[PDB]
Amino acid sequence: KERRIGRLSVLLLLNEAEESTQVEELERDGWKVCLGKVGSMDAHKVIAAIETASKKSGVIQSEGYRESHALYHATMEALHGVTRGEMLLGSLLRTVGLRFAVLRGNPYESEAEGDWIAVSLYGTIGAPIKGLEHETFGVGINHI
Amino acid sequence: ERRIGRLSVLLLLNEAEESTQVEELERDGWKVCLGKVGSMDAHKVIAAIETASKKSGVIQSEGYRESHALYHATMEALHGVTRGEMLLGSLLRTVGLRFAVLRGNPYESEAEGDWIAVSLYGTIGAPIKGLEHETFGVGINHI
Amino acid sequence: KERRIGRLSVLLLLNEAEESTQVEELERDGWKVCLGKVGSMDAHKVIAAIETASKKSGVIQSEGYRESHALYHATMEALHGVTRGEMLLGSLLRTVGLRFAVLRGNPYESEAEGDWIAVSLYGTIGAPIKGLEHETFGVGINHI
Amino acid sequence: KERRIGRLSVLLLLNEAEESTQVEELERDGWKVCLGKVGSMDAHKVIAAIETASKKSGVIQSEGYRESHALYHATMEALHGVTRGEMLLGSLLRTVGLRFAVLRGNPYESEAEGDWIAVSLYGTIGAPIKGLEHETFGVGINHI
Amino acid sequence: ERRIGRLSVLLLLNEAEESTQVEELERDGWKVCLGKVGSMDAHKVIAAIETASKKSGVIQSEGYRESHALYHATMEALHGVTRGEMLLGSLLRTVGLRFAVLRGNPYESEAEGDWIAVSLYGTIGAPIKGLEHETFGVGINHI
Amino acid sequence: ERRIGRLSVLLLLNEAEESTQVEELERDGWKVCLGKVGSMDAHKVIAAIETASKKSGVIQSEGYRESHALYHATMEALHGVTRGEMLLGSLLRTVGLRFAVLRGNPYESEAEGDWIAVSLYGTIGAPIKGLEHETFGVGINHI
Ligand SMILES: NC(Cc1cnc[nH]1)C(=O)Nc1ccc2ccccc2c1
Ligand SMILES: NC(Cc1cnc[nH]1)C(=O)Nc1ccc2ccccc2c1
Numbered sequence: 001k002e003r004r005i006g007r008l009s010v011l012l013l014l015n016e017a018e019e020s021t022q023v024e025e026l027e028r029d030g031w032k033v034c035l036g037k038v039g040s041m042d043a044h045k046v047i048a049a050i051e052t053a054s055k056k057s058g059v060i061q062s063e064g065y066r067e068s069h070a071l072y073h074a075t076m077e078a079l080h081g082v083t084r085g086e087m088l089l090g091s092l093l094r095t096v097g098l099r100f101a102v103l104r105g106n107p108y109e110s111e112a113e114g115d116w117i118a119v120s121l122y123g124t125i126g127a128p129i130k131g132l133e134h135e136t137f138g139v140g141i142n143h144i
Numbered sequence: 145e146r147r148i149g150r151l152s153v154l155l156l157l158n159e160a161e162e163s164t165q166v167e168e169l170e171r172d173g174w175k176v177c178l179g180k181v182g183s184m185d186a187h188k189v190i191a192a193i194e195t196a197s198k199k200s201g202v203i204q205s206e207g208y209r210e211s212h213a214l215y216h217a218t219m220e221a222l223h224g225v226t227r228g229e230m231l232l233g234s235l236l237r238t239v240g241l242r243f244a245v246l247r248g249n250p251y252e253s254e255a256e257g258d259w260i261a262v263s264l265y266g267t268i269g270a271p272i273k274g275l276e277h278e279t280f281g282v283g284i285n286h287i
Numbered sequence: 288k289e290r291r292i293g294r295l296s297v298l299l300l301l302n303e304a305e306e307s308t309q310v311e312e313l314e315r316d317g318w319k320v321c322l323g324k325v326g327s328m329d330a331h332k333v334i335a336a337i338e339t340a341s342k343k344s345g346v347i348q349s350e351g352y353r354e355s356h357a358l359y360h361a362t363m364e365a366l367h368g369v370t371r372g373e374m375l376l377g378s379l380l381r382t383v384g385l386r387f388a389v390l391r392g393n394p395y396e397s398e399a400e401g402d403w404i405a406v407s408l409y410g411t412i413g414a415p416i417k418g419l420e421h422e423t424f425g426v427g428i429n430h431i
Numbered sequence: 432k433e434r435r436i437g438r439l440s441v442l443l444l445l446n447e448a449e450e451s452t453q454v455e456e457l458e459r460d461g462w463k464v465c466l467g468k469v470g471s472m473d474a475h476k477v478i479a480a481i482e483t484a485s486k487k488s489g490v491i492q493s494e495g496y497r498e499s500h501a502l503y504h505a506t507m508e509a510l511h512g513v514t515r516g517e518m519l520l521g522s523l524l525r526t527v528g529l530r531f532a533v534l535r536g537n538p539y540e541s542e543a544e545g546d547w548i549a550v551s552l553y554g555t556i557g558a559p560i561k562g563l564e565h566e567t568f569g570v571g572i573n574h575i
Numbered sequence: 576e577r578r579i580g581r582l583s584v585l586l587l588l589n590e591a592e593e594s595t596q597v598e599e600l601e602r603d604g605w606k607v608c609l610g611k612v613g614s615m616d617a618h619k620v621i622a623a624i625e626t627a628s629k630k631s632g633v634i635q636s637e638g639y640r641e642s643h644a645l646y647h648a649t650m651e652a653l654h655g656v657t658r659g660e661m662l663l664g665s666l667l668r669t670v671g672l673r674f675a676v677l678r679g680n681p682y683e684s685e686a687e688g689d690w691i692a693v694s695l696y697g698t699i700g701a702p703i704k705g706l707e708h709e710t711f712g713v714g715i716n717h718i
Numbered sequence: 719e720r721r722i723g724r725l726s727v728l729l730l731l732n733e734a735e736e737s738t739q740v741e742e743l744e745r746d747g748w749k750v751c752l753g754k755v756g757s758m759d760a761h762k763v764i765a766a767i768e769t770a771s772k773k774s775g776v777i778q779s780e781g782y783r784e785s786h787a788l789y790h791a792t793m794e795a796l797h798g799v800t801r802g803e804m805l806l807g808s809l810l811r812t813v814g815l816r817f818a819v820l821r822g823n824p825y826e827s828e829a830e831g832d833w834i835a836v837s838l839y840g841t842i843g844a845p846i847k848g849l850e851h852e853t854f855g856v857g858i859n860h861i
């Protein structure tokens with residue numbers, strides 16, 4: 001096995017099959033998990049949904065700003081990717097369905113320099129042509 | 145439901161035994177290329193991907209059309225792995241890049257609508273500490 | 288003469304002089320033509336106007352998705368160009384007047400590998416300064 | 432001292448201390464000055480605020496289009512910078528507070544080839560996370 | 576109605592006999608440069624355009640100002656012809672690029688408002704099949 | 719009120735006697751690097767900044783993390799000074815680039831929230847006319 005938070009984060013995101021057990025195996029291994037969905041690609045809307053769904057699950061303590069700040073940057077990088085480029089032209093109150101996953105823990109290695117946190121996003125953006133949707137994908141790894 | 149993009153990433157991360165996954169998808173109609181490059185330099189990655197892509201039949205040895213889609217799918221994915229800074233990927237020493245290419249029809253219609261996806265998983269390491277950061281990227285284009 | 292669909296497509300677009308005869312010469316040479324205008328730079332608005340004006344003219348059969356899909360990609364490339372970059376800052380419910388041209392046929396050569404299709408756009412984007420307008424231009428060639 | 436319009440322009444912008452005297456020293460040295468603020472990052476909104484605050488101060492004569500045109504390009508470059516890139520994702524009716532400075536005169540050197548004009552912008556963009564704001568900065572130098 | 580951009584493209588495509596078009600516009604107040612380069616490499620194109628531009632008086636042999644506008648008009652147009660991937664234009668072998676530069680006043684006012692437009696027509700060929708794709712680009716900047 | 723970005727620019731323009739400003743900020747908790755490069759080539763600038771940055775303790779001699787933030791802050795600032803055309807900065811001959819790096823906490827909280835800002839002031843000159851244009855850029859990233 002590998003304690004690769006990013007890899008784990010994406011696999012968790014990309015498997016619509018028994019997240020129930022896939023999540024428990026992660027939680028059982030020191031990882032804090034958290035999943036969800038958002039029908040908005042809007043930065044505000046996404047970092048809100050995520051910050052929220054994450055505090056309630058224990059992925060990050062709402063005690064202050066530090067842990068919330070680490071999550072934001074991670075989410076932005078991941079979002080900065082979802083809004084690739086051809087997704088810069090696609091901006092006409094279109095339909096978007098992003099699903100995410102957040103992992104928080106320690107990509108151990110040998111040194112416990114601290115805790116990391118991954119935020120991966122996967123969704124679809126409707127095309128202005130019926131029967132055509134584009135796949136989006138973004139990941140953001142940050143150090144708490 | 146036939147996500148070329150999603151499929152390519154999974155192939156990329158599932159270090160289970162792609163040998164099954166490749167033949168499982170190859171027999172399912174797709175074209176597959178799996179490789180690894182020790183650089184995140186735009187030019188180097190493209191060349192490698194391009195070589196491994198033809199040598200595997202994922203793309204015909206000649207023809208601007210298919211090559212252009214590969215290149216773009218690849219360029220779009222490279223922007224993911226170099227975290228929004230193509231140029232600095234050239235600057236990264238001691239780095240591993242695994243790539244997966246998938247060419248095929250996204251839907252079941254007769255309409256060829258042939259598409260190609262390049263998925264990149266980057267591991268930026270350190271001569272000492274080892275893995276220090278991971279990077280992902282994806283490119284999905286029609287042929 | 289040249290059976291260059293792109294070149295033809297642009298000249299047709301760029302000549303406000305007797306499109307009547309310039310169109311007939313193209314139609315007479317195996318090309319399917321179609322022109323129009325749009326006051327929107329919005330992707331949705333543009334690919335809609337175009338898909339429409341094109342099916343009605345016979346540039347593409349609405350029979351399915353394939354031919355409509357080839358037109359969309361062509362239009363996006365052409366639009367991806369109209370929305371250059373300084374047109375990424377210019378986005379304040381400004382005034383835009385895009386004119387287009389669509390050509391469909393066979394850039395023959397020797398092999399009839401199939402049919403191509405060009406979509407060229409030319410228009411103006413008003414500046415937030417009276418007496419100043421920027422010229423836009425985009426072309427998208429695709430294979431049916 | 433230096434007759435560097437850009438340098439001067441930025442220092443004027445970046446000093447919330449006695450612009451009163453910092454402005455007079457510039458006016459006393461052949462420079463035409465002008466400062467202000469805008470709560471919008473919108474191109475239209477910004478080039479409007481600036482064109483206005485500038486004509487009223489004598490930075491540019493409203494007599495025609497030439498001097499107004501030189502100001503627009505200068506403002507766009509400066510704005511093109513304020514809307515860096517991570518400010519391309521940050522676009523959800525967020526809060527922005529731009530402050531500016533405009534200098535017009537002659538970066539003398541030896542030749543009076545004419546008159547230049549600098550437009551520098553400095554402000555803050557609120558983050559979708561409480562207790563986090565990004566700093567923006569842009570400068571645009573143009574020749575009247 | 577005096578579209579520098581539109582004018583430059585037409586000059587580029589009208590292979591009628593530009594010799595008339597160039598003198599027809601040269602006497603109409605514009606500066607004109609017409610050339611061809613066998614590459615879509617950013618650096619190569621700029622250098623060529625730059626040389627042909629000065630050697631034709633479209634721009635003074637020295638002076639950062641005019642050179643900067645040419646470069647930008649050129650860079651904006653190069654993004655058109657390399658279909659949104661500057662870097663891959665460097666990668667294209669066997670390709671033709673015809674270019675047209677036009678410097679002059681866009682309106683009739685006394686206000687110099689000197690502008691420059693670079694128009695690019697790219698032909699991406701194949702050692703065999705010949706022409707496989709066409710690419711266009713335009714750049715319009717004030718001096 | 720503790721604007722790392724604003725602070726770095728001021729340090730860059732205030733040619734008063736930074737010797738005081740550097741020690742005034744160094745004792746105020748920040749890390750400071752002040753340098754000059756005779757090029758606007760992305761690679762050259764980064765290398766210089768990188769060298770001067772470590773040699774000054776603004777960043778640890780090793781470690782992908784801090785290096786990545788410097789690089790990005792630097793890349794964001796380079797887009798300012800090359801006026802939106804990274805590639806053409808490489809093309810500029812006879813040019814001066816002064817740079818300022820600042821690494822430290824933006825607020826007073828215990829939460830490290832360590833940030834780094836790169837500020838660039840470019841002077842594009844002419845072998846004759848001298849200064850012909852000035853260019854500014856700024857990059858602000860968290861570590
Ligand atoms: N797929 C990823 C990132 C990633 C994947 N694994 C690690 N990082 C993405 O969207 N990255 C990006 C994109 C633009 C950016 C712009 C500024 C800073 C970081 C950025 C990161
Ligand atoms: N003038 C053209 C294209 C062209 C002209 N002739 C052929 N192609 C344009 O706008 N191209 C673009 C721009 C961005 C793009 C981004 C992604 C994919 C294709 C793209 C094509």
Ligand SMILES: NC(Cc1cnc[nH]1)C(=O)Nc1ccc2ccccc2c1
Pocket residue numbers: 373437508509510511512513568569570571572797798799801802852853854855
């Ligand atoms: N800080 C500066 C500019 C500058 C500073 N000093 C001189 N110029 C900025 O925002 N520049 C930019 C950015 C994008 C641009 C895009 C097109 C043309 C000019 C551009 C100038």
